[PDB]
Design a protein around this ligand. Structure first.
Ligand SMILES: OC[C@H]1NC[C@H](O)[C@@H](O)[C@H]1O
Ligand SMILES: OC[C@H]1NC[C@H](O)[C@@H](O)[C@H]1O
Lengths: 718, 718, 143, 146
């Protein structure tokens, strides 16, 4: 009774142990069979109790599982936990049946990686069951054909006569036989999202999580087990990516016997879910990627998968527009005149899209009011949104709009009319973040209002771009429309409502490129990527700061989704003075755009913009859709370097960065990756080099002084 | 507005911040005043919401707290969490009043460190309260005068008119300003408890815990923050020790701003506690220790505190008897004839105590029955317990007895008469560990039965020693005598019952030396130490294996409570063959005893035991009550070394161990600690050396081959 | 140090094998094993002395030591494993092999048939064993 | 005459030097190593085989220092103390992957296996007869083969 999933060049093996227990066997490089799946020492482990008292060698505490529970002889953290009406939390899932079908199913009300054809993947559903309480849990396994991708999710269903309160419902849980690994997660904060942190495993519990009702800047919903000697180019890597934009738990547990339990899903903390007889619960999926070619190998798998089989819309395989954003340029202080006046210059520079940011609606001359009142400010925009987009479109420029539909200002017409439409709890002070409150997306009336309001605003003007922002984390989580026994479902219901809101709006407006945002990369997760094919990576627009941020973001998320804008100096977040050349090279290593006041730019800088915009247009397809290789990590020293390679390896773009200048420095060298060794490459403005030479020998770098420098070379085969 | 606790040579500083928020300030080497407690930058941290909408510089997500909560502008792991009847988990504790009184209070139904005089310590009780729900929480702080010890615990009380469910109630929580620390905890298993694990802190969550209803072999209730360069002899160390013997959580959380939140208490997982209007809840205490003298400085503080102000009874300050246990010798196969037969030789060897282990009651020929039926098996002991004890005393030996009152075998008269007295949940298979079930000590009838039955047994014979054992971990945790809304209180109510049971039994029998046990050091925690002054360290009685175990154990617990027996070879746990000299030297480094078959020994071996016993008696006071220094760690190399120093530093005992011998080895050297540098010492059997010479230069060790060697020297001042 | 004759044999078979001890002081049991040791090494002498050598576990990095000898055509293999200090209640041990044809299944003498790709990518569970200074040696033959 | 030999089936480069005095005066070789090579970078670890009698050739992995590191023998024999072999390995190189550069001396007497890292991050690896306590005299017409 053995299940075998073949995903790309990888294998995921499961087994039915004894009387209907689902046991984990193997995950790694693909094998034909695991003959020694049951050929392991059956040991009597002291203080590991037995479901069958007669056999001391069997214990759920010492069994590698796929969906473990606590209570019946397992003392490790469970994948799920259900509390009965009698108060007990003991459950017992046994194998009932299974089914295998080509393709990949949709998740109910949740984002998920998909397929366009049946042959692209195969799905294994393992139906477990607890007969005493009628609890049915279906484990959804999907294996992609071309990629090393295994996705996992669980669907609960109450087929009993009693009420079941889910205390914990993680998306997956896998027990590794050994624990001699490091682990990489992506901690951070606002202005510095997703720093790569590598740590050795401890004997106990390690976890990255979010209690902020969002994926957050503090911890990105992604963890990975790496081999001790694994680097960017080689070694075994196991990735764990959560397709969900709310609260999450990403945990690794090492027990007494050197096994490592990796579990991931909706954070159990402050979370419950009542299941009446007949009701069901669907968990979001976790994308699990294996690679024996280091972090680059893993990331590239994620890059292709998320860009072609997660992101949607007409702009999925489309080159993204080079836009100009007015946020850092003017903030709230702007008008229709100043925007139209500068639009002439922008079109001459090669800019393709003008994006009107926060401050167009209500009385938004600051960030303390007007949220929820999505009506055009006539004092600032006399001709309205349609009039502005009109004057912009005739100059060959596209128009874009900024919205934060999940938020409501206390000082707004919406909050005066609907004070109960926000997240709150009875008789408690309503705490504010950036002087605003969170709308109750758990409610059907609130969601329907937003869906109708926003859809009309975006259709009231020839708009082809929308920036969806959110600048607050949930506090006083609760809903008036929910009974006391369902109050802890509020956070997830909010995220479900949000997913419902975005799905309907984006459907009504297919001609609109949506870009998710949240004080920068506060929601840079696979969930948001499903609804909006790109994200504002970080509010930190500093060239040097972006080195770490974009490097870490690229570990999981594709470049096509990684928004990067050239800003002004001294930087508004750090005060650093870097050359326009290096700012461009950094931003051209992502989804390229601008965000600065052109009126304050010198004629030399204005000229460099024209050159930059023209340059990125020649490499836009290469940067956004090509294979991405990281070379030098800014987390490991004074340098940063990466490169983009085409599918046929005929073209390539290389970027190099050095932050702090060294007097009388040693000669610098750079070794490349992903090029065809059996072919020569011309490095534009540097000469012809061998493909084998650039990878095995490397290339001498120009000697340069000055802080914060950058180099870009276009590589073409001969 | 600043609370200042002065514990020994250390300071613990707190302050009231704004509208009655209790904030942490400083903990480390003693200072007169922290004048810069408020002189820190007030920043607007993005996505960190504000209790005061006008002031973005204030947030509970950025405040160093003493007992933080989740829900109102704090996104880090809370010290507690309460669910109201309306379903909300938002609470808001503010300052009310505080009291300061000499001495130290007892904790209701809980073990705690104590004082014999008011002058020995002061106690600060800060009263916090949530006006809306009528919740009063009293934070209990106690600072000792001579030791660097701050103890913390909390007391809840529902003064409102509604029910309150404590989802989480940790004993303490503290926010360090920085997070540049390593952390040490004590993971392990049966036969290898408390291995010292040093790990760097991760940005996120690291934790050591227990979900087994016992402090467990797997994770000892102790974590510590140490400086990056702190070792055994120098550097800042922050110890956290849980005075509790059940489920626990010991967590460290590093946030986005590099602050470290250390929290410890009853494990929130699978735990709730309902508080009816008028009801209360007292948490166990956490003993917090600071030292700048490294790990030795921390341990020695714990040693004096736990030995003299936690352990109780008439044997607290008394030298512990050199006993002999028969468990490894005969196991279950013994009789009255065999015991008094060998007891003649045991008396002549100098042994002071004969301990009768498992197998004396009911029909214990196996570990499959009789647990619960605590009557003497007349088949094995025809003259009963009274008869066997008298034949022992007449040979000049004390008599001891083994019990496991917390358990019940399905095959027993107790279970057939009371099958609902065990821990169980409705309609679920009753899992067995070592073919036994756990008794429901949450019930008054069960406890009352045990208190009466055990007291009568131990009074039916001249017994002066008791080995209290437990060989299973709780599964299917539930009580038939509890309402469904209190089922998750079972695990803690069990521990309360056990404490009550142990407290009354040891009170009826003040003349009996009680030693706790749990398949070894399964519950070697401060909680158990309060009721029983010593503990069986590990079932692993291998001299080399005991090096790591006893080394790790001494980090927190005093040598006086660290049981160590000399066993036979090849060892029963690892099959290792070490010399009797070595096994003696390892065991004499703790509470010395024997546990092997004497009849199977040779003539030259019995003469060594006679010398070992005599030698230990001469240094028993020094070993059990002297100052302990770790010199060489078996976790860091092939060697292990430590020493005992008298209070006036005039007498010392040095132990050295070398596991694997290397051919043509470099010369070995050993530097000592805690000696008077201004005084010479005579190493017995080596010569006269200077105190400064032994500490600063060291002593050249004699070269010798073979594996598993040991050296022991007595040091006397001239 | 006192180590068993079996492990002493297994270590010496991992090189140019020979003997250097007083045979007259050996017990009957020890001389029997010695005869089997000589016969066994003769079967794998060409493999050990002229085959491809792979190191698996380093005794400079941990409590273990492991290596294997692979023939030129990768149809034969001799795997040796060593564990020095025994730990009580030890975690399960595993050993991943190297230098085998992943497309072929291999027969481990005594145990059974394992996949070449399995032996390299997944590894094989080792028997739990007590006592210090233990050794295990398996002959591998392509199916 | 610098002698270089490259094998076909193996990644083996062998090196040796041959001195010859074709002048009128006599020359004194104070040092005559078999080879020397300057690596452009020096971000490597190095492995040598130190030991003693009864424990020869233990593996020792160490990071490179900016300066001089060397294994050598002054015992008139290759010795148990230091085996005539050193290697430059990549920082992430192990038993199964990574770039390694082995240097093996085909000589049984005194040796010097030295790695020097200069002010500009270059690594000079040289190996040959130990210069210490060693000289060689070349009269006009005489030769010395390393
Ligand atoms: O308030 C507007 C501001 N919010 C945060 C976003 O990330 C910025 O780009 C900008 O849109
Ligand atoms: O079964 C008895 C056994 N239980 C476990 C203890 O640790 C042993 O010493 C012995 O008392």
């Amino acid at each position: 009774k053995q299940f075998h999933l073949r995903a790309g060049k990888a294998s995921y093996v499961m087994q039915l142990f004894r009387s209907g227990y689902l046991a984990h066997v193997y995950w790694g490089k693909a094998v034909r069979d695991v003959r020694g799946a049951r050929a392991f020492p059956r040991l009597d482990r002291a203080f590991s109790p037995n479901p069958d008292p007669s056999d001391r060698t069997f214990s759920l505490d010492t069994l590698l599982q796929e969906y473990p529970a606590y209570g019946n002889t397992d003392f490790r953290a469970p994948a799920y936990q259900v509390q009965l009406e009698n108060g007990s939390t003991v459950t017992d899932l046994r194998y009932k049946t299974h089914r295998i079908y080509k393709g990949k199913p949709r998740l109910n009300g949740l984002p998920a990686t998909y397929v366009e054809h049946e042959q692209e993947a195969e799905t294994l559903e393992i139906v477990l069951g607890d007969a005493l309480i009628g609890l049915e849990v279906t484990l959804q396994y999907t294996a992609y054909e071309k990629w090393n991708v295994i996705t996992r999710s669980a669907r609960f269903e109450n087929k009993g006569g009693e009420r079941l309160k889910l205390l914990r419902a993680l998306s997956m849980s896998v027990d590794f036989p050994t624990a001699d690994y490091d682990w990489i997660h992506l901690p951070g904060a606002w202005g510095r999202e997703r720093w790569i942190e590598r740590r050795p495993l401890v004997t106990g519990v390690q976890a990255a999580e979010s209690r902020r009702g969002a994926s957050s800047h503090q911890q990105n919903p992604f963890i990975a087990l790496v081999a001790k000697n694994a680097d960017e180019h080689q070694g075994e890597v196991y990735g764990f990516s959560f397709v969900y934009s709310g609260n999450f738990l990403a945990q690794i547990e090492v027990d007494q016997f050197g096994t490592a339990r990796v579990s991931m899903g909706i954070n159990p903390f402050d979370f419950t879910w009542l299941l009446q007889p007949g009701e069901s619960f669907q968990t979001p999926e976790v994308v699990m990627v294996y690679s024996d070619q280091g972090l680059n190998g893993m990331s590239q798998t994620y890059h292709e998968l998320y860009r072609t089989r997660l992101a949607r819309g007409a702009f999925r395989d489309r080159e993204r527009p080079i836009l100009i954003n007015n946020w850092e340029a003017t903030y709230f202080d702007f008008n229709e005149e100043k925007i139209v006046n500068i639009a002439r210059t922008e079109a001459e520079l090669g800019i393709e899209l003008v994006v009107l940011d926060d401050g167009w609606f209500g009385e938004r001359d600051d960030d303390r009011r007007s949220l929820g009142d999505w009506i055009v400010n006539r004092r600032k925009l006399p001709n309205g949104l349609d009039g502005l987009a009109k004057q912009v479109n005739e100059l060959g420029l596209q128009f874009g709009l900024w919205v934060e539909p999940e938020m409501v200002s206390p000082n707004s017409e919406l909050y005066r009319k609907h004070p109960d439409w926000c997240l709150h709890v009875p008789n408690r002070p309503r705490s504010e973040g950036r002087n605003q409150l969170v709308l109750d997306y758990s409610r059907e009336d609130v969601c329907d209002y937003i869906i109708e309001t926003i859809s009309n605003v975006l259709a009231s003007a020839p708009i082809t771009y929308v920036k969806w922002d959110m600048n607050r984390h949930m506090t006083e989580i609760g809903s008036s429309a929910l009974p006391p026994e369902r109050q802890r479902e509020t956070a997830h219901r909010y995220m479900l409502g949000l997913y419902r809101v975005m799905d309907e709006i984006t459907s009504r407006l297919p001609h609109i490129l949506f870009e998710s945002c949240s004080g920068g990369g506060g929601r840079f997760d696979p969930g948001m990527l499903y609804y909006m094919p790109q994200t504002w990576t970080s509010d930190n627009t500093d060239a040097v700061s972006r080195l770490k941020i974009q490097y870490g973001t690229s570990l999981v998320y594709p470049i096509s989704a990684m928004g990067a804008h050239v800003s002004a100096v001294p930087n508004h977040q750090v005060g650093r003075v870097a050359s326009l050349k290096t700012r461009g090279h950094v931003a051209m290593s992502g989804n390229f755009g601008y965000e600065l006041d052109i009126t304050k730019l010198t004629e030399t800088e204005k000229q460099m913009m024209k050159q930059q915009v023209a340059f990125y247009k020649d490499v836009r397809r290469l940067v956004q859709f090509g294979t991405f290789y990281r070379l030098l990590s800014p987390f490991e020293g004074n340098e940063a370097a990466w490169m983009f390679v085409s599918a046929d390896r005929s073209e390539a773009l290389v970027a190099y960065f050095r932050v702090l200048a060294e007097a009388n420095a040693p000669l610098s060298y750079l070794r490349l990756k992903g090029l065809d060794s059996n072919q020569d490459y011309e490095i534009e403005g540097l000469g012809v080099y061998g493909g084998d030479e650039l990878v095995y020998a490397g290339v001498a770098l120009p000697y340069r002084s000055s802080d914060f420098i950058s180099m870009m070379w276009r590589l073409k085969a001969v």
